[PDB]
Design a protein around this ligand. Sequence first.
Ligand SMILES: *C(=O)CCCCCC
Ligand SMILES: *C(=O)CCCCCC
Lengths: 127, 141
Amino acid sequence: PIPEPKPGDLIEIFRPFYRHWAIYVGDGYVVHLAPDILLALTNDKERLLLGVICKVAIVKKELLYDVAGSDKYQVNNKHDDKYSPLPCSKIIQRAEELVGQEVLYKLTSENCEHFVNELRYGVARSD
Amino acid sequence: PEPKPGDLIEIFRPFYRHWAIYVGDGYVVHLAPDILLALTNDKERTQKVVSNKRLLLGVICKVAIVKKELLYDVAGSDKYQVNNKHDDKYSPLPCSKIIQRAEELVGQEVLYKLTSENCEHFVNELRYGVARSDQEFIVTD
Ligand SMILES: *C(=O)CCCCCC
Ligand SMILES: *C(=O)CCCCCC
C-alpha cells in the first residue's frame, strides 16, 4: 500500500461533503480540531447572572483509523515550500498540549453592557 | 421621560438584564442573542462544477448580532431605566460620535466558522508555528 505518515505530517481527509484536517503525532494517532456542539444555560454567581455557553469544537487525540473511517486521506504538507516546519518532536509536543482545548463563547448580560459602554465612552473596563 | 441620544438603557427581563444604547427617534442599538447553526456551502468550485454533489466549507455558529430596533419592541413588557453608570468616572464621548459609532456596528455578528479552512489554519499553526486570527469566536467587520 502507501507508506504510514510521519510525525508532524498534515493529513487531509476527504469526507463526502467537506475536507477534514488533522496532524499526525505518532503510533497511529492524530490530533485534530473536531466538532463538539453544546449549548448550555448557566447561573454564574456574584442574585445570579444567567449565561449562555456555546461550545462548537474541541481538540481531540484519536486514532487516524477512527477519524478517517471509510474516507480516504492523504499526507499534504503543502506549505513546506514557503514555511519551515518546526522540528518534528516540537510539533508533536505542541499538538499534545492543545488536546482538550475548546472553542466556545460565553454570553451574559456583561458582554452587552461592555458593548454599550464601549460606544458611550470608548472604554473597555476590566472587572 | 424619554432617553437622550447616547444613553445606556438597562432592561429588566425576568432572568437577566439586557442592555442597549439609545440613538434617537425611538431607536436603540443593541447586541441581540441570535443563536444559529447554519451549513456553509463550498463556493471555490462554484464556477467549475463537475459533480452535482453539494459540497460544504463547514458550519457557522452564530451567537449574537448587533441590531437597531425600537426601544418599545426591545423592552416588550419588561421595565427599563436610563443608567449611565460610569459618568462619575470619566465623561461620555460627544453624543454625535456615540451614535455614529453605534450605527456603523449594526449587522455585525458574533460567530465561529468551523470550516476546512479554519481546521487547516489550526494544523498549520502546529506544524509551522505560523500564528492564527481565527481560533476563537470573532466579531465580523
Ligand atoms: C476541520 O477540519 C473540521 C471541520 C468540520 C466541519 C463540519 C461541518
Ligand atoms: C445582552 O444584553 C444580552 C445578554 C443575553 C444573556 C442571556 C443569558
